[PDB]
Every structure is written in C-alpha cells, then in structure tokens.
Design an enzyme around this catalytic site. Structure first.
Site, PDB file in Angstrom:
ATOM      1  N   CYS A  77       0.666  -1.174   0.055  1.00  0.00           N
ATOM      2  CA  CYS A  77      -0.155   0.107  -0.087  1.00  0.00           C
ATOM      3  C   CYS A  77       0.787   1.285   0.253  1.00  0.00           C
ATOM      4  O   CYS A  77       1.537   1.590   1.071  1.00  0.00           O
ATOM      5  CB  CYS A  77      -1.089  -0.034   1.197  1.00  0.00           C
ATOM      6  SG  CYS A  77      -1.882   1.430   1.231  1.00  0.00           S
ATOM      7  N   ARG A 117      -0.050   4.629   2.938  1.00  0.00           N
ATOM      8  CA  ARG A 117       0.062   4.287   4.190  1.00  0.00           C
ATOM      9  C   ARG A 117       0.635   5.717   5.214  1.00  0.00           C
ATOM     10  O   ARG A 117       0.383   5.612   6.292  1.00  0.00           O
ATOM     11  CB  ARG A 117       0.991   3.175   4.463  1.00  0.00           C
ATOM     12  CG  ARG A 117       0.583   1.793   4.293  1.00  0.00           C
ATOM     13  CD  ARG A 117       1.469   0.885   4.656  1.00  0.00           C
ATOM     14  NE  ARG A 117       2.339   0.428   3.565  1.00  0.00           N
ATOM     15  CZ  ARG A 117       3.561  -0.163   3.628  1.00  0.00           C
ATOM     16  NH1 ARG A 117       3.723  -0.827   4.809  1.00  0.00           N
ATOM     17  NH2 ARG A 117       4.311  -0.284   2.707  1.00  0.00           N
TER      18      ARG A 117
HETATM   19  C1  HEM Z   1      -6.325   6.794   1.781  1.00  0.00           C
HETATM   20  C2  HEM Z   1      -5.923   6.420   0.463  1.00  0.00           C
HETATM   21  C3  HEM Z   1      -5.322   5.381  -0.255  1.00  0.00           C
HETATM   22  C4  HEM Z   1      -4.552   5.304  -1.254  1.00  0.00           C
HETATM   23  C5  HEM Z   1      -4.284   6.572  -2.275  1.00  0.00           C
HETATM   24  C6  HEM Z   1      -4.109   4.071  -1.116  1.00  0.00           C
HETATM   25  C7  HEM Z   1      -3.334   3.476  -2.268  1.00  0.00           C
HETATM   26  C8  HEM Z   1      -3.098   2.098  -2.695  1.00  0.00           C
HETATM   27  C9  HEM Z   1      -2.606   1.608  -4.240  1.00  0.00           C
HETATM   28  C10 HEM Z   1      -2.801   2.240  -5.022  1.00  0.00           C
HETATM   29  C11 HEM Z   1      -2.911  -0.124  -4.015  1.00  0.00           C
HETATM   30  C12 HEM Z   1      -2.683  -0.880  -5.075  1.00  0.00           C
HETATM   31  C13 HEM Z   1      -3.880  -1.203  -5.399  1.00  0.00           C
HETATM   32  C14 HEM Z   1      -3.907  -2.290  -6.778  1.00  0.00           C
HETATM   33  O1  HEM Z   1      -3.177  -2.093  -7.653  1.00  0.00           O
HETATM   34  O2  HEM Z   1      -5.090  -2.772  -6.693  1.00  0.00           O
HETATM   35  C15 HEM Z   1      -3.068  -0.247  -2.635  1.00  0.00           C
HETATM   36  C16 HEM Z   1      -3.094  -1.449  -1.960  1.00  0.00           C
HETATM   37  C17 HEM Z   1      -3.266  -1.761  -0.588  1.00  0.00           C
HETATM   38  N1  HEM Z   1      -3.954  -0.905   0.136  1.00  0.00           N
HETATM   39 FE1  HEM Z   1      -3.721   1.114  -0.033  1.00  0.00          FE
HETATM   40  N2  HEM Z   1      -4.437   3.301  -0.295  1.00  0.00           N
HETATM   41  C18 HEM Z   1      -5.166   4.101   0.386  1.00  0.00           C
HETATM   42  C19 HEM Z   1      -6.074   3.582   1.725  1.00  0.00           C
HETATM   43  C20 HEM Z   1      -5.777   2.273   2.393  1.00  0.00           C
HETATM   44  C21 HEM Z   1      -6.643   2.062   3.675  1.00  0.00           C
HETATM   45  C22 HEM Z   1      -7.673   2.914   4.201  1.00  0.00           C
HETATM   46  C23 HEM Z   1      -6.545   0.490   3.844  1.00  0.00           C
HETATM   47  C24 HEM Z   1      -6.719  -0.215   4.850  1.00  0.00           C
HETATM   48  C25 HEM Z   1      -7.348   0.297   5.966  1.00  0.00           C
HETATM   49  C26 HEM Z   1      -5.395   0.075   2.818  1.00  0.00           C
HETATM   50  C27 HEM Z   1      -4.866  -1.320   2.717  1.00  0.00           C
HETATM   51  C28 HEM Z   1      -4.249  -1.728   1.230  1.00  0.00           C
HETATM   52  C29 HEM Z   1      -4.102  -3.294   1.034  1.00  0.00           C
HETATM   53  C30 HEM Z   1      -4.401  -4.614   2.161  1.00  0.00           C
HETATM   54  C31 HEM Z   1      -3.481  -3.152  -0.039  1.00  0.00           C
HETATM   55  C32 HEM Z   1      -3.076  -4.288  -1.065  1.00  0.00           C
HETATM   56  C33 HEM Z   1      -4.245  -5.153  -1.483  1.00  0.00           C
HETATM   57  C34 HEM Z   1      -3.653  -6.404  -2.245  1.00  0.00           C
HETATM   58  O3  HEM Z   1      -2.662  -6.831  -1.882  1.00  0.00           O
HETATM   59  O4  HEM Z   1      -4.251  -6.751  -3.320  1.00  0.00           O
HETATM   60  N3  HEM Z   1      -5.147   1.346   1.716  1.00  0.00           N
HETATM   61  N4  HEM Z   1      -3.398   0.918  -1.816  1.00  0.00           N
END
Ligand code: HEM
Ligand code: HEM
Ligand SMILES: N=C(Nc1cccc(OCCOc2cccc(NC(=N)c3cccs3)c2)c1)c1cccs1
Ligand SMILES: N=C(Nc1cccc(OCCOc2cccc(NC(=N)c3cccs3)c2)c1)c1cccs1
Ligand SMILES: C[C@H](O)[C@H](O)[C@H]1CNc2nc(N)[nH]c(=O)c2N1
Ligand SMILES: C[C@H](O)[C@H](O)[C@H]1CNc2nc(N)[nH]c(=O)c2N1
Ligand SMILES: [Zn+2]
Lengths: 407, 411
Positions: free
Chosen positions: A106, A109
């Site tokens: 992510c 973060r």
């Molecule tokens: C606040 C704005 C946020 C932005 C801009 C952001 C950005 C991203 C991006 C670009 C990815 C890659 C996703 C993909 O290619 O499908 C990602 C993956 C992830 N994010 Fe964040 N995120 C944010 C908030 C969060 C929140 C609130 C959580 C959990 C509370 C989180 C947990 C994760 C997890 C678990 C993955 C990996 C999913 C996987 O492994 O398939 N994200 N995030």
C-alpha cells in the site's frame, strides 16, 4: 540481521531492524525469489493473542504494567474457556490501523493513523450488514471529501458462520459477456455479475451498472441489495483540452472500497472487513481503462487523437495513456472528489518510509506493487530499495466465497 | 518440486523445474524478500565440483554426456586443477559458457537473442595496449555501421587475484561528467567519479557536455593506462523529434553501442574479470533513464518548458508528457539514422515469447521482474502482468567492486 536499504537517486541509506519481528512467511527462499507472484486451535491462539497485546501495551507506554498482565490473564482465561476471545474497542481500533500500517503493497500508508473504524461486531443478518455498509459508504464519501474507513463484522468462530461480502469492492461496475462474443461493461467481474443475475438481479444491462451488494451473514446464503444511488458518488470523465473525450462516455466511482479481504488481529479472523480510502489516479486511468483484460480503450482514444498507430515505435499507446490519465485527474479534481496522482502519492510514501524508519525501525514495502504502473522511473519510489516482510495485524487474501460456501 | 507462474492478462500458466538446478543465493529467505535490492580467490577445494558441473552441462548440450570425450575432458581438467590449481577452457566451452551466462541473466529483457553472440577470445592478451586493440576491434565489429551485432571480448581469467585484467570504464563508450565549483554538473552526472580518475591519470578533458571518455585499461594486475577510442569508431546519433523542431536545439545526442565492461563472467568456477559485452539499446534506457533520471541529464523540465505544459501542478502530468516525447525522439533519431534500437513494447513482447519457449525447451527462465519491467508505461507492456521466478544459474554475469576501490597501485 540489520539490513540496509539505499535510495539510488538520493544516496539516503536506512537501516531496517523491524523485519526481525517478521511473524509470517514471504514465498521466497534462499534459492528462489517470488517477489512477483500475486499470491505465494486453542493453543495456536494464545501465542498470537500475547504477541498482539504485548505490542498494544507497548504502543501506549504500558508494557509490563499491572493492567498489561491482568489483560493477558483475562484473555488467557477466555481462550482456555471459550476457545476464542473478544478484543476491547481500543485493541480493535489499534489492530485495524496496524493492519493498514503493515500493508506492504500500500502506497497510501502515510495516512494510516487517520482511519475511522466502525465496529460492526453486533451485526447478525445481511440486512444489518447492508445498513452498516450504507453508513460506511456515506461516511467515507462525505460528498467527495473522502475519509478513510473500515467496518468490521463479527470474527470467525468455527468457520461455518462466516460473514462475507461477496463483492470484491463495495462499488464496482457489472460485466456481461455477450452473444456478440466480446464483453460489455467490466470484464473483471463477469463471473460475479452472473452470480448476481443467477441470484435474481435485474441488470440494467449497460456499461457502467453499479453492481448490487451480495451479503452473507453468519454463514447463511447471501442476499442482494441495491446501494442507494444517491450514496454512490460518480465522476464523468472529461479532458482539459480534448472535447471529443467526453463522447467516449467514460465514468468512474469516487470510492474504492475493498471488501474481499481478511483482517487478522491477535489470531482473530475478520472475514468481512470492507475498507476504503481514495484512488491514486493511475488505478483508474492506467489499469481499469487500459488493461487489455479491462475497459481496454487505448486503441479507441489513440484514434480520436489521430496518432500514428502503424508501428509500436511511434509510442501511440504511451501518448494516449498519459492523456487518459490527465483526464481522470482533471475530472475528479474539477468535481472536487479526492484523488491523488502518482507523483504526489509516491513522494508521500518516501516521506512515510523515512518516518517509519526513524520512528519504528522500518517499513515493509513491496516494490512490485508500490511502483506505479506508468512513469515508474520518474517517481521517487522506483529508485528506492525496499524490504518486504509480513507483520501482524495484517490484511490477507482469502478464497472467493462461492468456492467455499455450502448452500 | 514443480513451480507455477501465471500471466494475469492471458491466464497462461507455465511450470518451472529449472529452478532445481539453481546453485547460488538470492538474498531472500522465508522471512524477507530482497527482490528490490540492487546488490544483495577459489581453492582447488571449491574449484573441482564447479568445473565438473559446468562440463556435465556442456557435455549434455552437445549430446555427449557420459561419453569417452566427456570423461577424458573431466580427467584432464581435474589433473590440471590439482597440478596448477586452475584450468583453461577450450574455445568451444568458452563460447558455450558466455552464451549461457547471457541466457541465465535474469535482469535481461533482451535474451531472445542469446544464441547469436559473437565471442572474441582475448585470452592470449598480455598488456593494456593489447586490450585497447581487442576493444577497438570489438567496437568496430559490433557497431557494423549501425547494424549492431552482439559480441563479447574475453580477456584472461583471474589467477591469484593480484594479476587481474580489468576495464575501469563501466561501459566502453560513455560521456564525461564534470562537477562545477557552483555545484552543478556538465555532461553526465553518473560518470563524475570515473571522469575525475581519468583526468587525474592524465586525460586532457575537452570539458563539454558529450565528451566520450578514454578507455582506462588494466592488464595483468598492473596500473591502468589511458587510450582514446578512435572517433571514427564511435557511432553517434543526434537527437531530434519528428514533429518538434526545437528539439534538435536542445543539443542532445547519444552513442549507438551500449557495451558493459565492469561485470565479472563466471564459467565453471573460473572468473573472467574483464569481459566487455555489447548488444543494442532499448529506447527507454536513453529516453527514460539517461535523459530523465533526476541524477542524470535531467532534461524533463527544459523539454516541458518548450512544450509549454502546465508545470505548476504535478497532476497536469507534465513530467509524464515530456517523458513520452523525449522517448519518441530517441527512437525516431536512431531509426532515421539506421542505427539498431528496440522500443519497449517490441522488446517486452519478444521477451514473453522467449520466456514461454524457455519454459518448454529448458524447463524455465529465471527472470527479475523489477528489472525486466520497463521504467515507463509498465502495465501496457505484457511483462507487467507476467509472474516470474528469479533464481541464479551458472555460467553467470556478476557484479564486482569498482577497481579503484581494491587496486594496489604499483606507482
Ligand atoms: C487513503 C487513501 C489510499 C490510497 C491513495 C491508497 C493507495 C493504494 C494503491 C494504489 C494500492 C495498489 C492497489 C491495486 O493495484 O489494486 C493499494 C493496496 C493496498 N492498500 Fe492502500 N491506499 C489508501 C488507503 C488504504 C486503507 C484505508 C487501507 C486499509 C485500511 C489500505 C490497505 C491496502 C491493502 C491491504 C493493499 C493491497 C491489496 C492487495 O494486496 O491486493 N489502503 N493502496
Ligand atoms: C541484444 C540486445 C540487447 C538488449 C535490447 C538488451 C536489453 C537489456 C536492458 C534494457 C537491460 C536493463 C539494463 C539497465 O537498466 O541498465 C539489460 C540487462 C542485462 N543484460 Fe541485456 N540486452 C541485450 C543484449 C545483452 C547481451 C549481448 C548480454 C551479455 C552477453 C546482456 C546481459 C545483461 C546483463 C548481465 C544485465 C544485467 C545488468 C545488471 O545487473 O546491472 N544483454 N539488457
Ligand atoms: N482487475 C482484475 N481483477 C480484479 C477483480 C475484482 C477486484 C479487483 O481488485 C483488486 C484490489 O484492488 C485494490 C486493493 C487495495 C487498494 C485499492 N485501491 C485503493 N485506492 C483503495 C481501496 C481501499 C482503500 S484504498 C484497490 C481486481 C484483473 C485484471 C487482470 C487480471 S485480474
Ligand atoms: N546510471 C547510474 N550509474 C551507472 C553508471 C555506469 C553504467 C551504468 O549502467 C547500469 C547497467 O547498465 C546496463 C547493463 C546491462 C545492459 C545494458 N543495456 C544494454 N542494452 C546492453 C549493454 C550491453 C549489452 S546490451 C545496460 C550505470 C546511476 C544513476 C543513479 C545512481 S547510479
Ligand atoms: C531499488 C531498485 O531496485 C532500483 O532503482 C532498480 C529498479 N529497477 C531497475 N530496472 C532496470 N532495468 N534498471 C535499473 O537500473 C533499475 N533500478
Ligand atoms: C505478476 C505481477 O506481480 C502482477 O501483474 C502485479 C504487478 N504489480 C502490481 N501492482 C499493483 N499496484 N497492482 C497490481 O495489480 C499489480 N499487478
Ligand atoms: Zn524474494
């Protein structure tokens, strides 16, 4: 044992000690790196509970206090007796924020500690789940000023009573494979779209039909519900210079809300834990629109741009890709829906990495996922060595419910 | 053990068994992945099994495994090792070895071409002047008036580690970088340290933005010596854009022949510390990295200015827009001048086909995703969606420390 990571753009060297608390396994061995693979009992529980409560009491400067030892004792008794235990609200909130903090894939973060946690552990039916989810959507959407949120349904028990959101995200567009042979709407969800229809959904049969929610409480058969469209904030996509762009008829939803993941806190399993933040622009404009297996519109856009599509070496795919992405960003910004561009998100992440090295001793990071799908080397993350390891609390993948559910 | 990789665009699944022949280490463990970390004298003792492994492989490839020719060669090598503590490769084995090191290079997107490699055997070389002569011939043969041909020149192997042959240059052809008293850099920032060594060694520096560096050559553990590559041997391409006429006025050019000269070639436990090799460029190597890295020529701003992009907010993607134009320019210039180049769509597509072929015929293809995925437009290339397994086979190309860090100066 103490590992260094180097930024090759800046020469900054950071020292990682945090990995030595790595609890889970990576997929890799001494002999084989699997960095690019998408997915590589009563007394099991107490170690897990203890490890977690230890870090909880450590976080609030109370490691080894009476209240600490007393809570260990209490959880110990509860397990010994019930074969599980219940987190306090405080422990729940801390655990969820840390599952996000520990998400090595992510990029977003920096924001990890501003997370609104909606405790839905008293939920008992799919209707209740639906209620909770609408509230989460409305709260997180906030009329375009997006706020991160997670809603946490009851934990796994005997594993026959699981809560699940069958949707992979709360808000996604429908996919219909046609008598034509091609695919109308979003081909990523064709299977789920049919599972909905075979369940009773009446498809408006268009290209951007917001899917119905399909919800499973306490191990029962899932039920369909339409999210109030007034709760689903969408953005028509236009370009700040190309007026024909609008005529492609593209839209996207403001709220990305992942709903198929499993949240693990102190050995406890939360199989329904939909969480949301906001989009980085490339998620929509690079992957959703341009992946061959997705809306795959590059060819269409390149034409309207009258680029030379005769030879890959004119870089027409590339030139179009950029325009599409400028448009997505422009549209969301114009309509005042939160979005972040990849330049800004990656710079934020470097700042976040620094903080975490300094304040925590490290930051698990998966380079393969952190580097954006366009313009990689012009973003600072491309030049940043990262170490990837698995800490808990965490978010984990779990099988699609249909592959498990007994009717 | 059987390992599967999936392509997420095509659902094509491949099975790796080749990884079982993997000897060396990755850096990773069950508990940590070092997949993005850039870098994570032998006795007879260790030399015997390495020689044997290699000769078993060589003798399998020629369909003579377990033959009398195979056994005799084993005995002969074995005798040489215990008599002299080392051994010499036959020409055929050297050629096969260098080819396989390339084929095993998991960071190389260009490996479809692995079997067409011109090997130049420079193992009779004894002096830096000899090395200059070998390297000029390699440059001329490889360049071939713009129609590039892959080649490698193999200087004598390590003996006691005090007699190393080294090319101090990181590539045979590269531009000078000069740090100015005001903190700015003229020419290529990547080469400032090497440029200073050259000047110190007595190079008279033209001090412009595109000065081809002199070769600095070390033979037999002696102090290195300077040579100018004849300019007539250095093929260059002025950079212009097909629509943007002011682009030429940016004053950019690049050299056509990428020729890496700081890596160590390992074959049957023998170490070849000077083994310059060359092929041709992928456009992004110049257009993305060489021109647009912040720590390199960094022309993104000047290009963006002249395109009159909105440079006030990153979300205009002005950086992204200018990057694409520079890269179109690089490909257009090379093609117009009839100098071999490959764009990143075409190269990654070829690599995917090479890779599937390698799984069929060889049981696998070690591949480093971090390096194979191009530095722009990642997901619109088929390698982005390809799961890859990274592991280490010998023969191999390895890193080695820069020689100014280990060399004992004779004076
Ligand atoms: C606040 C704005 C946020 C932005 C801009 C952001 C950005 C991203 C991006 C670009 C990815 C890659 C996703 C993909 O290619 O499908 C990602 C993956 C992830 N994010 Fe964040 N995120 C944010 C908030 C969060 C929140 C609130 C959580 C959990 C509370 C989180 C947990 C994760 C997890 C678990 C993955 C990996 C999913 C996987 O492994 O398939 N994200 N995030
Ligand atoms: C024939 C045309 C070729 C093309 C288009 C090609 C393409 C590439 C590219 C784009 C890279 C990444 C380089 C970087 O980012 O600096 C690379 C890496 C590499 N290539 Fe190839 N290559 C070709 C021929 C060869 C040949 C002839 C050899 C050796 C005989 C070779 C061995 C390698 C090695 C060892 C690396 C890794 C470098 C490192 O780890 O730093 N390449 N190649
Ligand atoms: N898109 C595909 N599959 C697919 C199907 C259904 C769902 C799906 O989602 C992938 C996970 O999406 C995420 C995960 C985490 C974060 C994000 N993006 C976000 N900005 C956030 C979501 C929640 C908080 S931030 C998206 C992916 C495929 C393309 C090619 C082969 S499969
Ligand atoms: N560019 C830098 N340093 C640097 C200096 C000198 C050489 C150098 O090259 C990196 C490795 O270069 C390769 C390696 C293998 C293949 C290629 N490219 C090719 N197409 C071929 C070269 C030879 C046969 S094919 C380039 C990199 C840095 C920027 C920021 C921090 S360090
Ligand atoms: C830290 C990271 O490994 C480093 O910046 C890498 C990323 N991928 C790369 N890929 C290629 N082809 N060449 C490179 O120099 C790099 N640099
Ligand atoms: C095989 C490869 O790991 C897979 O295509 C990955 C690559 N990097 C990614 N990175 C992000 N952020 N999202 C993705 O879906 C993917 N896909
Ligand atoms: Zn690994």
């Amino acid at each position: 044992r103490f590992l260094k990571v180097k930024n090759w753009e800046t020469d900054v060297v950071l020292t990682d000690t945090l990995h030595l608390k790595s609890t889970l396994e990576t997929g890799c061995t001494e002999h084989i790196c699997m960095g690019s693979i998408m997915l590589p009992t009563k007394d099991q529980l107490f170690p897990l509970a203890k490890e977690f409560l230890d870090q909880y009491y450590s976080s609030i400067k109370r490691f080894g206090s009476k209240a600490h030892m007393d809570r260990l004792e209490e959880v110990n008794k509860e397990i010994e007796s019930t074969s599980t235990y219940q987190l306090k609200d405080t422990e729940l909130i801390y655990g969820a924020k840390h599952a996000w903090r520990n998400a090595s894939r992510c990029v977003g973060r920096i924001q990890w500690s501003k997370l609104q946690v909606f405790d839905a552990r008293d939920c008992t039916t799919a209707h209740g789940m639906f209620n909770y989810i609408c509230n989460h959507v409305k709260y997180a959407t906030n009329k375009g000023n997006l706020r991160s949120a997670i809603t946490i349904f009851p934990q796994r028990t005997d594993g026959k009573h699981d809560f699940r959101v069958w949707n992979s995200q709360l808000i996604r567009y429908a996919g219909y494979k046609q008598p034509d042979g091609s695919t109308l709407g979003d081909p990523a969800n064709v299977q789920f779209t049919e599972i909905c229809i075979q369940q009773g959904w009446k498809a408006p049969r268009g290209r951007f039909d917001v899917l119905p929610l399909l919800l499973q409480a306490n191990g029962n058969d899932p039920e369909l519900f339409q999210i109030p469209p007034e709760l689903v904030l969408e953005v028509p996509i236009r370009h700040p210079k190309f007026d024909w762009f609008k005529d492609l008829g593209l839209k996207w939803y403001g709220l990305p809300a992942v709903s198929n993941m499993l949240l693990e806190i102190g050995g406890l399993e939360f199989s329904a834990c939909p969480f949301s933040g906001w989009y980085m622009g490339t998620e929509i404009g690079v992957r959703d629109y341009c992946d061959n297996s997705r809306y795959n519109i590059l060819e269409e856009v390149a034409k309207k741009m009258d680029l030379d599509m005769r030879k890959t070496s004119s870089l027409w795919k590339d030139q179009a890709l950029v325009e599409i992405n400028i448009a997505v960003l422009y549209s969301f910004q114009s309509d005042k829906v939160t979005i972040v561009d990849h330049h800004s998100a990656t710079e934020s992440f470097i700042k976040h990495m620094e903080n975490e090295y300094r304040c925590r001793g490290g930051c698990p990071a998966d380079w393969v996922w952190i580097v954006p799908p366009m313009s990689g080397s012009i973003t600072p993350v491309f030049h940043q060595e990262m170490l990837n390891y698995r800490l808990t609390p965490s978010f984990e993948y779990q099988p699609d419910p249909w592959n498990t559910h007994v009717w």
